[PDB]
Each structure stands twice: as structure tokens, then as C-alpha cells.
């Protein structure tokens, strides 16, 4: 698997559903498709609820059953934020999907997933900076220079900021606290 983990904003923007859930199964491999299925119990829906209303129940999430093709392998108690894509009728995640304990999120991340990340999806893009040199090539991009860090998921941009309109033609990294 050679995927690159997206910024939480990018994960929110690109996902069809964003939910909170406990993992309850032991997961099972479907022998015909070779997707692994996890059972969950969903406690909240943060994106999708406009379409599915209060009927929204998501009981299963799917991933490739092999590590090599980007399956997510879940590491007992905890509610998780899951940001997934709907593919061929199923909610899918990969090892690059944003999936994490709700209690491990910063207050800013919780604000982004519930309210603020949506503000940047139409207008702004978190652009990668995976090696030196890297270039900021458009005014509507925010350059994710935290990707140079060892603990990149815990950088300031990743953990406390969003890429949001600032002026006509210009997005910037902005504090969610």
C-alpha cells in the first residue's frame, strides 16, 4: 500500500459519510470479494444525516482483506470517528482513511468534523509537502508542511488548523481554537 494519509479536512471533504461508532465484531472476511467486514454500533452521524435523516443506521464498514492493497486493520471500548467513502453500495475505508478514537481528537478536530471543515471543501485545497523542495502553486491552496515532520498527524496544521477562505482567491491556514 502506497497511500498517503490526508489532512482531517481533506478526509471530511472527500468522505460520503462521517460517523462515530464502536467496533463490536470480530471482523469477517468475505471469501468471494476478499473484503473484510467490521460490525459497528453507530452513535452519531456528522456528514450524511441530511440525506438519511434519523433513520440513519450504519452497522457495517468494509476494507480490503489484504494489507498490501490498503486494508485497515483495527488495533476495545472506544468510540471512533470514521470518515468513509461509499463504493458499490458499501461504506469503505482503507489504511489511509481518517479513523481514530474520538477521545484522541483535539477540540479543534472535533470542531472541524462537526462544524468547520465543510467551509473549505468547495474553495480550498490542502496541498502536499512531502519532500524539500515543495511549492505553493495556487492562492487557494494551503501547503501542508507538517508532512515533513516525523509526528505529522500531531503537527499544528494537522491538529489545530483548517484551510479556509480568507480573501477572494486566497485560502489560509486558520485556527479552529
CSV table of N, CA and C in Angstrom, one decimal:
chain,number,residue,atom,x,y,z
A,1,UNK,N,0.9,-1.2,0.0
A,1,UNK,CA,0.0,0.0,0.0
A,1,UNK,C,0.9,1.3,0.0
A,2,UNK,N,0.7,2.1,-1.0
A,2,UNK,CA,1.5,3.4,-1.0
A,2,UNK,C,0.6,4.6,-0.9
A,3,UNK,N,-0.5,4.5,-0.2
A,3,UNK,CA,-1.4,5.7,0.0
A,3,UNK,C,-0.7,6.7,1.0
A,4,UNK,N,-1.1,8.0,0.9
A,4,UNK,CA,-0.6,9.0,1.9
A,4,UNK,C,-1.8,9.5,2.7
A,5,UNK,N,-1.7,9.4,4.1
A,5,UNK,CA,-2.8,9.9,4.9
A,5,UNK,C,-3.2,11.3,4.6
A,6,UNK,N,-4.5,11.6,4.3
A,6,UNK,CA,-4.9,13.0,4.1
A,6,UNK,C,-5.1,13.8,5.4
A,7,UNK,N,-5.0,15.1,5.3
A,7,UNK,CA,-5.3,16.0,6.4
A,7,UNK,C,-6.8,15.7,6.8
A,8,UNK,N,-7.1,15.9,8.1
A,8,UNK,CA,-8.5,15.7,8.5
A,8,UNK,C,-9.6,16.4,7.7
A,9,UNK,N,-9.3,17.7,7.3
A,9,UNK,CA,-10.2,18.4,6.4
A,9,UNK,C,-10.4,17.7,5.1
A,10,UNK,N,-9.3,17.3,4.4
A,10,UNK,CA,-9.4,16.6,3.2
A,10,UNK,C,-10.2,15.3,3.4
A,11,UNK,N,-10.0,14.6,4.5
A,11,UNK,CA,-10.7,13.4,4.8
A,11,UNK,C,-12.2,13.7,4.9
A,12,UNK,N,-12.6,14.7,5.7
A,12,UNK,CA,-14.0,15.1,5.8
A,12,UNK,C,-14.6,15.4,4.4
A,13,UNK,N,-13.9,16.3,3.6
A,13,UNK,CA,-14.4,16.8,2.3
A,13,UNK,C,-14.6,15.7,1.3
A,14,UNK,N,-13.7,14.7,1.3
A,14,UNK,CA,-13.8,13.6,0.3
A,14,UNK,C,-14.7,12.5,0.7
A,15,UNK,N,-15.1,12.4,2.0
A,15,UNK,CA,-15.9,11.3,2.5
A,15,UNK,C,-17.4,11.5,2.2
A,16,UNK,N,-18.1,10.4,2.0
A,16,UNK,CA,-19.6,10.4,1.8
A,16,UNK,C,-20.3,10.4,3.2
A,17,UNK,N,-19.7,9.6,4.1
A,17,UNK,CA,-20.3,9.6,5.5
A,17,UNK,C,-19.1,9.8,6.5
A,18,UNK,N,-19.5,10.5,7.6
A,18,UNK,CA,-18.6,10.7,8.7
A,18,UNK,C,-19.5,10.4,9.9
A,19,UNK,N,-19.0,9.4,10.7
A,19,UNK,CA,-19.8,8.9,11.8
A,19,UNK,C,-18.9,8.7,13.1
A,20,UNK,N,-19.5,8.5,14.2
A,20,UNK,CA,-18.9,8.0,15.4
A,20,UNK,C,-19.5,6.6,15.7
A,21,UNK,N,-18.7,5.7,16.1
A,21,UNK,CA,-19.1,4.3,16.3
A,21,UNK,C,-18.1,3.5,17.1
A,22,UNK,N,-18.6,2.5,17.8
A,22,UNK,CA,-17.8,1.5,18.4
A,22,UNK,C,-17.7,0.3,17.4
A,23,UNK,N,-16.5,-0.3,17.5
A,23,UNK,CA,-16.3,-1.6,16.8
A,23,UNK,C,-16.7,-2.7,17.7
A,24,UNK,N,-17.5,-3.6,17.2
A,24,UNK,CA,-18.1,-4.6,18.1
A,24,UNK,C,-17.8,-6.0,17.6
A,25,UNK,N,-17.6,-6.3,16.3
A,25,UNK,CA,-17.5,-7.7,15.9
A,25,UNK,C,-16.2,-8.4,16.5
A,26,UNK,N,-16.0,-9.6,16.1
A,26,UNK,CA,-14.7,-9.8,15.5
A,26,UNK,C,-15.0,-9.7,14.0
A,27,UNK,N,-14.2,-9.0,13.2
A,27,UNK,CA,-14.4,-8.9,11.7
A,27,UNK,C,-14.3,-10.2,10.9
A,28,UNK,N,-15.0,-10.2,9.8
A,28,UNK,CA,-15.0,-11.4,9.0
A,28,UNK,C,-14.6,-11.1,7.5
A,29,UNK,N,-13.9,-12.0,6.9
A,29,UNK,CA,-13.5,-11.9,5.5
A,29,UNK,C,-14.6,-12.5,4.6
A,30,UNK,N,-15.0,-11.8,3.6
A,30,UNK,CA,-15.9,-12.4,2.6
A,30,UNK,C,-15.0,-13.1,1.5
A,31,UNK,N,-15.2,-14.4,1.4
A,31,UNK,CA,-14.3,-15.1,0.5
A,31,UNK,C,-14.5,-14.8,-0.9
A,32,UNK,N,-15.7,-14.4,-1.4
A,32,UNK,CA,-15.8,-14.1,-2.8
A,32,UNK,C,-15.2,-12.7,-3.2
A,33,UNK,N,-15.4,-11.7,-2.4
A,33,UNK,CA,-14.9,-10.3,-2.7
A,33,UNK,C,-13.5,-10.1,-2.2
A,34,UNK,N,-13.2,-10.8,-1.1
A,34,UNK,CA,-11.9,-10.5,-0.3
A,34,UNK,C,-11.9,-9.1,0.3
A,35,UNK,N,-13.1,-8.7,0.7
A,35,UNK,CA,-13.2,-7.6,1.6
A,35,UNK,C,-13.5,-8.1,3.0
A,36,UNK,N,-12.8,-7.5,4.0
A,36,UNK,CA,-13.1,-7.7,5.4
A,36,UNK,C,-14.2,-6.7,5.9
A,37,UNK,N,-15.1,-7.3,6.7
A,37,UNK,CA,-16.3,-6.6,7.2
A,37,UNK,C,-16.1,-6.5,8.7
A,38,UNK,N,-16.2,-5.2,9.2
A,38,UNK,CA,-16.3,-4.9,10.7
A,38,UNK,C,-17.8,-4.6,11.0
A,39,UNK,N,-18.3,-5.2,12.1
A,39,UNK,CA,-19.5,-4.7,12.6
A,39,UNK,C,-19.2,-3.5,13.5
A,40,UNK,N,-20.1,-2.5,13.5
A,40,UNK,CA,-20.0,-1.4,14.4
A,40,UNK,C,-21.4,-1.1,15.0
A,41,UNK,N,-21.4,-0.4,16.1
A,41,UNK,CA,-22.6,0.3,16.6
A,41,UNK,C,-22.4,1.9,16.5
A,42,UNK,N,-23.2,2.5,15.7
A,42,UNK,CA,-23.1,3.9,15.4
A,42,UNK,C,-23.8,4.7,16.4
A,43,UNK,N,-23.2,5.8,16.9
A,43,UNK,CA,-23.7,6.6,17.9
A,43,UNK,C,-24.0,8.0,17.4
A,44,UNK,N,-23.4,8.5,16.4
A,44,UNK,CA,-23.6,9.8,15.8
A,44,UNK,C,-23.3,9.8,14.3
A,45,UNK,N,-24.0,10.6,13.5
A,45,UNK,CA,-23.6,10.8,12.2
A,45,UNK,C,-23.4,12.3,12.0
A,46,UNK,N,-22.2,12.7,11.4
A,46,UNK,CA,-21.9,14.1,11.3
A,46,UNK,C,-21.9,14.6,9.8
A,47,UNK,N,-21.8,13.7,8.9
A,47,UNK,CA,-22.0,14.0,7.5
A,47,UNK,C,-22.7,12.8,6.9
A,48,UNK,N,-23.8,13.1,6.2
A,48,UNK,CA,-24.8,12.1,5.7
A,48,UNK,C,-26.2,12.2,6.3
A,49,UNK,N,-26.3,12.9,7.5
A,49,UNK,CA,-27.5,12.9,8.2
A,49,UNK,C,-28.6,13.7,7.5
A,50,UNK,N,-28.2,14.7,6.8
A,50,UNK,CA,-29.1,15.5,5.9
A,50,UNK,C,-29.8,14.6,4.9
A,51,UNK,N,-29.1,13.5,4.4
A,51,UNK,CA,-29.7,12.6,3.4
A,51,UNK,C,-30.5,11.4,4.0
A,52,UNK,N,-30.0,10.9,5.1
A,52,UNK,CA,-30.5,9.7,5.7
A,52,UNK,C,-31.5,10.0,6.9
A,53,UNK,N,-31.5,11.3,7.4
A,53,UNK,CA,-32.4,11.7,8.5
A,53,UNK,C,-32.0,10.9,9.8
A,54,UNK,N,-33.0,10.7,10.6
A,54,UNK,CA,-33.0,10.0,11.9
A,54,UNK,C,-33.1,8.4,11.7
A,55,UNK,N,-33.4,8.0,10.5
A,55,UNK,CA,-33.3,6.6,10.1
A,55,UNK,C,-31.9,6.1,9.9
A,56,UNK,N,-30.9,7.0,9.9
A,56,UNK,CA,-29.5,6.6,9.6
A,56,UNK,C,-29.0,5.6,10.6
A,57,UNK,N,-28.8,4.4,10.1
A,57,UNK,CA,-28.1,3.4,10.8
A,57,UNK,C,-27.1,2.7,9.9
A,58,UNK,N,-25.9,2.7,10.4
A,58,UNK,CA,-24.8,2.1,9.7
A,58,UNK,C,-24.3,1.0,10.7
A,59,UNK,N,-24.4,-0.2,10.2
A,59,UNK,CA,-24.0,-1.4,11.0
A,59,UNK,C,-22.7,-2.0,10.6
A,60,UNK,N,-22.2,-1.8,9.3
A,60,UNK,CA,-21.1,-2.5,8.8
A,60,UNK,C,-20.2,-1.5,8.0
A,61,UNK,N,-18.8,-1.7,8.1
A,61,UNK,CA,-17.8,-1.0,7.3
A,61,UNK,C,-16.9,-2.0,6.8
A,62,UNK,N,-16.4,-1.7,5.6
A,62,UNK,CA,-15.7,-2.7,4.8
A,62,UNK,C,-14.3,-2.2,4.4
A,63,UNK,N,-13.3,-3.1,4.2
A,63,UNK,CA,-12.0,-2.7,3.8
A,63,UNK,C,-11.4,-3.9,3.1
A,64,UNK,N,-10.4,-3.7,2.2
A,64,UNK,CA,-9.7,-4.8,1.6
A,64,UNK,C,-9.1,-5.8,2.6
A,65,UNK,N,-9.2,-7.1,2.4
A,65,UNK,CA,-8.7,-8.0,3.4
A,65,UNK,C,-7.2,-8.2,3.4
A,66,UNK,N,-6.5,-7.6,2.5
A,66,UNK,CA,-5.0,-7.7,2.5
A,66,UNK,C,-4.4,-6.3,2.8
A,67,UNK,N,-3.3,-6.3,3.6
A,67,UNK,CA,-2.5,-5.1,4.0
A,67,UNK,C,-1.9,-4.5,2.7
A,68,UNK,N,-1.6,-5.3,1.7
A,68,UNK,CA,-0.8,-4.9,0.6
A,68,UNK,C,-1.7,-4.0,-0.3
A,69,UNK,N,-3.0,-4.2,-0.3
A,69,UNK,CA,-3.9,-3.4,-1.1
A,69,UNK,C,-4.7,-2.4,-0.2
A,70,UNK,N,-4.1,-2.0,1.0
A,70,UNK,CA,-4.5,-0.8,1.7
A,70,UNK,C,-5.7,-1.1,2.7
A,71,UNK,N,-5.8,-2.4,3.2
A,71,UNK,CA,-6.8,-2.7,4.2
A,71,UNK,C,-6.5,-2.0,5.5
A,72,UNK,N,-7.5,-1.5,6.3
A,72,UNK,CA,-7.4,-1.0,7.6
A,72,UNK,C,-7.5,-2.2,8.6
A,73,UNK,N,-6.5,-2.3,9.5
A,73,UNK,CA,-6.6,-3.4,10.5
A,73,UNK,C,-6.7,-2.8,11.9
A,74,UNK,N,-7.8,-3.0,12.5
A,74,UNK,CA,-8.2,-2.3,13.8
A,74,UNK,C,-7.4,-2.8,15.0
A,75,UNK,N,-6.8,-2.0,15.8
A,75,UNK,CA,-5.8,-2.4,16.7
A,75,UNK,C,-6.5,-3.1,17.9
A,76,UNK,N,-10.6,-1.6,22.6
A,76,UNK,CA,-11.8,-2.5,22.8
A,76,UNK,C,-13.1,-1.7,23.1
A,77,UNK,N,-12.9,-0.6,23.8
A,77,UNK,CA,-14.1,0.1,24.5
A,77,UNK,C,-14.6,1.2,23.6
A,78,UNK,N,-13.8,1.8,22.7
A,78,UNK,CA,-13.8,3.2,22.5
A,78,UNK,C,-14.7,3.6,21.3
A,79,UNK,N,-15.3,4.9,21.4
A,79,UNK,CA,-16.0,5.4,20.2
A,79,UNK,C,-14.9,5.9,19.2
A,80,UNK,N,-15.1,5.7,17.9
A,80,UNK,CA,-14.1,6.1,16.9
A,80,UNK,C,-14.8,7.1,16.0
A,81,UNK,N,-14.1,8.1,15.5
A,81,UNK,CA,-14.5,8.8,14.3
A,81,UNK,C,-14.1,8.1,13.1
A,82,UNK,N,-15.0,7.8,12.2
A,82,UNK,CA,-14.8,7.1,10.9
A,82,UNK,C,-15.2,8.0,9.8
A,83,UNK,N,-14.3,8.3,8.9
A,83,UNK,CA,-14.6,9.1,7.7
A,83,UNK,C,-14.5,8.1,6.4
A,84,UNK,N,-15.6,7.7,5.8
A,84,UNK,CA,-15.5,6.7,4.8
A,84,UNK,C,-16.2,7.1,3.4
A,85,UNK,N,-15.9,6.3,2.4
A,85,UNK,CA,-16.4,6.6,1.1
A,85,UNK,C,-17.4,5.4,0.7
A,86,UNK,N,-18.5,5.8,0.0
A,86,UNK,CA,-19.4,4.8,-0.4
A,86,UNK,C,-19.0,4.2,-1.7
A,87,UNK,N,-18.7,2.9,-1.8
A,87,UNK,CA,-18.3,2.3,-3.1
A,87,UNK,C,-19.1,1.0,-3.3
A,88,UNK,N,-19.8,0.9,-4.5
A,88,UNK,CA,-20.6,-0.2,-4.8
A,88,UNK,C,-21.6,-0.5,-3.7
A,89,UNK,N,-22.1,0.5,-3.0
A,89,UNK,CA,-23.2,0.4,-2.1
A,89,UNK,C,-22.8,0.2,-0.6
A,90,UNK,N,-21.5,0.0,-0.3
A,90,UNK,CA,-20.9,-0.3,1.0
A,90,UNK,C,-20.1,0.9,1.4
A,91,UNK,N,-20.0,1.1,2.8
A,91,UNK,CA,-19.1,2.1,3.3
A,91,UNK,C,-17.7,1.5,3.4
A,92,UNK,N,-16.7,2.1,2.8
A,92,UNK,CA,-15.4,1.6,2.7
A,92,UNK,C,-14.4,2.5,3.3
A,93,UNK,N,-13.4,1.9,4.0
A,93,UNK,CA,-12.2,2.6,4.5
A,93,UNK,C,-11.0,1.8,4.0
A,94,UNK,N,-9.8,2.5,4.1
A,94,UNK,CA,-8.5,2.0,3.9
A,94,UNK,C,-7.6,2.4,5.0
A,95,UNK,N,-6.4,1.9,5.0
A,95,UNK,CA,-5.4,2.2,6.0
A,95,UNK,C,-5.1,3.7,5.9
A,96,UNK,N,-5.3,4.4,4.8
A,96,UNK,CA,-5.2,5.9,4.8
A,96,UNK,C,-6.4,6.7,5.3
A,97,UNK,N,-7.6,6.0,5.4
A,97,UNK,CA,-8.8,6.7,5.9
A,97,UNK,C,-8.6,7.4,7.2
A,98,UNK,N,-9.2,8.5,7.5
A,98,UNK,CA,-9.2,9.0,8.8
A,98,UNK,C,-10.1,8.2,9.8
A,99,UNK,N,-9.5,7.4,10.7
A,99,UNK,CA,-10.2,6.6,11.6
A,99,UNK,C,-9.5,6.7,12.9
A,100,UNK,N,-10.1,7.2,14.0
A,100,UNK,CA,-9.4,7.4,15.3
A,100,UNK,C,-10.3,7.5,16.4
A,101,UNK,N,-9.8,7.1,17.7
A,101,UNK,CA,-10.7,7.3,18.9
A,101,UNK,C,-11.1,8.8,19.0
A,102,UNK,N,-12.5,8.9,19.2
A,102,UNK,CA,-13.0,10.3,19.4
A,102,UNK,C,-12.2,11.0,20.5
A,103,UNK,N,-11.9,10.3,21.6
A,103,UNK,CA,-11.2,10.9,22.7
A,103,UNK,C,-9.7,11.2,22.4
A,104,UNK,N,-9.2,10.8,21.3
A,104,UNK,CA,-7.8,11.1,20.9
A,104,UNK,C,-7.8,12.4,20.0
A,105,UNK,N,-9.0,12.9,19.6
A,105,UNK,CA,-9.0,14.1,18.8
A,105,UNK,C,-8.8,15.3,19.6
A,106,UNK,N,-8.2,16.3,19.1
A,106,UNK,CA,-8.2,17.7,19.7
A,106,UNK,C,-9.6,18.3,19.6
A,107,UNK,N,-9.8,19.4,20.4
A,107,UNK,CA,-11.0,20.1,20.4
A,107,UNK,C,-11.2,20.8,19.1
A,108,UNK,N,-10.1,21.2,18.4
A,108,UNK,CA,-10.2,21.8,17.1
A,108,UNK,C,-10.7,20.8,16.0
A,109,UNK,N,-10.1,19.5,16.1
A,109,UNK,CA,-10.5,18.5,15.2
A,109,UNK,C,-12.0,18.2,15.4
A,110,UNK,N,-12.5,18.1,16.6
A,110,UNK,CA,-13.9,17.8,16.9
A,110,UNK,C,-14.8,19.0,16.3
A,111,UNK,N,-14.3,20.2,16.5
A,111,UNK,CA,-15.0,21.3,15.9
A,111,UNK,C,-15.0,21.2,14.3
A,112,UNK,N,-13.9,20.8,13.7
A,112,UNK,CA,-13.8,20.6,12.3
A,112,UNK,C,-14.8,19.6,11.7
A,113,UNK,N,-14.8,18.4,12.4
A,113,UNK,CA,-15.6,17.3,11.9
A,113,UNK,C,-17.1,17.6,12.1
A,114,UNK,N,-17.5,18.4,13.1
A,114,UNK,CA,-18.9,18.7,13.4
A,114,UNK,C,-19.4,19.9,12.7
A,115,UNK,N,-18.5,20.9,12.5
A,115,UNK,CA,-19.0,22.2,12.0
A,115,UNK,C,-18.1,22.8,10.9
A,116,UNK,N,-16.7,22.9,11.1
A,116,UNK,CA,-15.9,23.9,10.4
A,116,UNK,C,-15.3,23.4,9.1
A,117,UNK,N,-14.9,22.1,8.9
A,117,UNK,CA,-14.1,21.7,7.8
A,117,UNK,C,-14.9,21.9,6.5
A,118,UNK,N,-16.3,21.7,6.6
A,118,UNK,CA,-17.2,21.9,5.5
A,118,UNK,C,-17.0,23.3,4.8
A,119,UNK,N,-16.6,24.3,5.5
A,119,UNK,CA,-16.4,25.7,5.0
A,119,UNK,C,-15.3,25.7,3.9
A,120,UNK,N,-14.2,24.8,4.0
A,120,UNK,CA,-13.2,24.9,3.0
A,120,UNK,C,-13.4,23.9,1.8
A,121,UNK,N,-14.4,23.0,1.8
A,121,UNK,CA,-14.4,21.9,0.8
A,121,UNK,C,-14.6,22.4,-0.6
A,122,UNK,N,-15.3,23.5,-0.8
A,122,UNK,CA,-15.6,23.9,-2.2
A,122,UNK,C,-14.5,24.7,-2.8
A,123,UNK,N,-13.8,25.5,-1.9
A,123,UNK,CA,-13.0,26.6,-2.3
A,123,UNK,C,-11.5,26.4,-2.2
A,124,UNK,N,-11.1,25.5,-1.2
A,124,UNK,CA,-9.7,25.5,-0.8
A,124,UNK,C,-9.2,24.0,-0.9
A,125,UNK,N,-7.8,23.9,-1.0
A,125,UNK,CA,-7.2,22.5,-1.0
A,125,UNK,C,-6.0,22.5,-0.2
A,126,UNK,N,-5.9,21.5,0.7
A,126,UNK,CA,-4.7,21.2,1.5
A,126,UNK,C,-3.8,20.5,0.5
A,127,UNK,N,-2.7,21.2,0.1
A,127,UNK,CA,-1.7,20.7,-0.8
A,127,UNK,C,-0.5,20.0,-0.1
A,128,UNK,N,0.0,18.9,-0.7
A,128,UNK,CA,1.1,18.1,0.0
A,128,UNK,C,2.4,18.8,-0.1
A,129,UNK,N,3.2,18.6,1.0
A,129,UNK,CA,4.6,19.0,1.0
A,129,UNK,C,5.4,17.8,1.7
A,130,UNK,N,5.7,16.8,0.9
A,130,UNK,CA,6.2,15.5,1.3
A,130,UNK,C,7.8,15.5,1.3
A,131,UNK,N,8.4,16.4,0.5
A,131,UNK,CA,9.8,16.5,0.5
A,131,UNK,C,10.2,17.9,0.1
A,132,UNK,N,11.5,18.2,0.4
A,132,UNK,CA,12.1,19.5,0.1
A,132,UNK,C,12.7,19.4,-1.2
A,133,UNK,N,12.6,20.3,-2.2
A,133,UNK,CA,11.7,21.5,-2.0
A,133,UNK,C,10.3,21.2,-2.4
A,134,UNK,N,9.3,22.0,-1.8
A,134,UNK,CA,7.9,21.9,-2.2
A,134,UNK,C,7.4,23.3,-2.5
A,135,UNK,N,6.3,23.4,-3.3
A,135,UNK,CA,6.0,24.6,-3.9
A,135,UNK,C,4.5,24.9,-3.6
A,136,UNK,N,4.2,26.2,-3.3
A,136,UNK,CA,2.8,26.6,-3.2
A,136,UNK,C,2.4,27.2,-4.5
A,137,UNK,N,1.5,26.5,-5.2
A,137,UNK,CA,1.3,26.8,-6.6
A,137,UNK,C,0.0,27.5,-6.9
A,138,UNK,N,-0.9,27.7,-5.9
A,138,UNK,CA,-2.1,28.4,-6.1
A,138,UNK,C,-2.5,29.1,-4.8
A,139,UNK,N,-3.2,30.3,-5.0
A,139,UNK,CA,-3.7,31.0,-3.9
A,139,UNK,C,-4.7,30.3,-3.0
A,140,UNK,N,-5.4,29.4,-3.6
A,140,UNK,CA,-6.5,28.6,-2.9
A,140,UNK,C,-6.0,27.4,-2.3
A,141,UNK,N,-4.6,27.2,-2.3
A,141,UNK,CA,-4.0,26.1,-1.5
A,141,UNK,C,-3.5,26.5,-0.2
A,142,UNK,N,-3.5,25.6,0.8
A,142,UNK,CA,-2.7,25.7,2.0
A,142,UNK,C,-1.6,24.6,1.9
A,143,UNK,N,-0.4,24.9,2.1
A,143,UNK,CA,0.7,24.0,2.0
A,143,UNK,C,0.9,23.2,3.3
A,144,UNK,N,0.8,21.9,3.2
A,144,UNK,CA,0.8,21.1,4.4
A,144,UNK,C,2.3,20.7,4.7
A,145,UNK,N,3.1,21.6,5.2
A,145,UNK,CA,4.5,21.5,5.5
A,145,UNK,C,4.7,20.6,6.7
A,146,UNK,N,3.7,20.4,7.6
A,146,UNK,CA,3.8,19.4,8.6
A,146,UNK,C,4.0,18.0,8.1
A,147,UNK,N,3.7,17.7,6.9
A,147,UNK,CA,4.1,16.4,6.3
A,147,UNK,C,5.6,16.1,6.3
A,148,UNK,N,6.5,17.1,6.4
A,148,UNK,CA,7.9,16.9,6.7
A,148,UNK,C,8.2,16.3,8.1
A,149,UNK,N,7.3,16.5,9.0
A,149,UNK,CA,7.6,16.0,10.4
A,149,UNK,C,7.6,14.5,10.5
A,150,UNK,N,8.3,14.0,11.5
A,150,UNK,CA,8.1,12.6,12.0
A,150,UNK,C,6.7,12.4,12.6
A,151,UNK,N,6.3,13.2,13.6
A,151,UNK,CA,4.9,13.2,14.1
A,151,UNK,C,4.0,14.1,13.4
A,152,UNK,N,3.7,13.9,12.1
A,152,UNK,CA,3.0,14.8,11.2
A,152,UNK,C,1.5,14.9,11.5
A,153,UNK,N,0.9,13.8,11.9
A,153,UNK,CA,-0.5,13.8,12.3
A,153,UNK,C,-0.7,14.7,13.6
A,154,UNK,N,0.3,14.9,14.4
A,154,UNK,CA,0.4,15.7,15.6
A,154,UNK,C,1.0,17.1,15.3
A,155,UNK,N,1.2,17.5,14.1
A,155,UNK,CA,1.7,18.9,13.8
A,155,UNK,C,0.6,19.9,14.0
A,156,UNK,N,0.9,21.2,14.1
A,156,UNK,CA,0.0,22.2,14.4
A,156,UNK,C,-1.1,22.3,13.3
A,157,UNK,N,-0.7,22.3,12.0
A,157,UNK,CA,-1.6,22.3,10.9
A,157,UNK,C,-2.6,21.2,10.9
A,158,UNK,N,-2.1,20.0,11.2
A,158,UNK,CA,-2.9,18.8,11.2
A,158,UNK,C,-3.9,18.8,12.3
A,159,UNK,N,-3.5,19.2,13.5
A,159,UNK,CA,-4.2,19.0,14.8
A,159,UNK,C,-5.1,20.3,15.1
A,160,UNK,N,-4.7,21.5,14.7
A,160,UNK,CA,-5.5,22.7,15.2
A,160,UNK,C,-6.0,23.6,14.1
A,161,UNK,N,-5.6,23.4,12.8
A,161,UNK,CA,-6.0,24.4,11.8
A,161,UNK,C,-6.8,23.7,10.7
A,162,UNK,N,-7.5,24.6,9.9
A,162,UNK,CA,-8.2,24.3,8.7
A,162,UNK,C,-7.8,25.3,7.6
A,163,UNK,N,-8.0,24.9,6.3
A,163,UNK,CA,-7.6,25.6,5.2
A,163,UNK,C,-8.9,26.2,4.7
A,164,UNK,N,-9.1,27.6,4.8
A,164,UNK,CA,-10.3,28.3,4.8
A,164,UNK,C,-10.2,29.6,4.0
A,165,UNK,N,-11.3,30.0,3.3
A,165,UNK,CA,-11.3,31.3,2.6
A,165,UNK,C,-10.8,32.4,3.4
A,166,UNK,N,-10.0,33.3,2.9
A,166,UNK,CA,-9.5,34.4,3.6
A,166,UNK,C,-9.8,35.8,2.9
A,167,UNK,N,-9.5,35.8,1.6
A,167,UNK,CA,-9.9,36.9,0.7
A,167,UNK,C,-10.3,36.3,-0.6
A,168,UNK,N,-10.9,37.0,-1.5
A,168,UNK,CA,-11.1,36.5,-2.8
A,168,UNK,C,-9.8,35.9,-3.4
A,169,UNK,N,-9.9,34.7,-3.9
A,169,UNK,CA,-8.7,34.0,-4.5
A,169,UNK,C,-7.7,33.4,-3.4
A,170,UNK,N,-7.9,33.6,-2.1
A,170,UNK,CA,-6.9,33.3,-1.2
A,170,UNK,C,-7.5,32.4,0.0
A,171,UNK,N,-7.0,31.2,0.2
A,171,UNK,CA,-7.2,30.4,1.4
A,171,UNK,C,-6.0,30.5,2.3
A,172,UNK,N,-6.2,30.3,3.6
A,172,UNK,CA,-5.1,30.3,4.6
A,172,UNK,C,-5.3,29.3,5.6
A,173,UNK,N,-4.3,28.9,6.3
A,173,UNK,CA,-4.4,28.1,7.5
A,173,UNK,C,-4.9,29.0,8.6
A,174,UNK,N,-6.0,28.5,9.2
A,174,UNK,CA,-6.8,29.3,10.2
A,174,UNK,C,-7.0,28.4,11.5
A,175,UNK,N,-6.9,29.1,12.6
A,175,UNK,CA,-7.0,28.4,13.9
A,175,UNK,C,-8.5,28.0,14.2
A,176,UNK,N,-8.7,26.7,14.5
A,176,UNK,CA,-10.1,26.3,15.0
A,176,UNK,C,-10.2,26.4,16.5
A,177,UNK,N,-9.2,26.9,17.2
A,177,UNK,CA,-9.3,27.5,18.6
A,177,UNK,C,-8.5,28.8,18.7
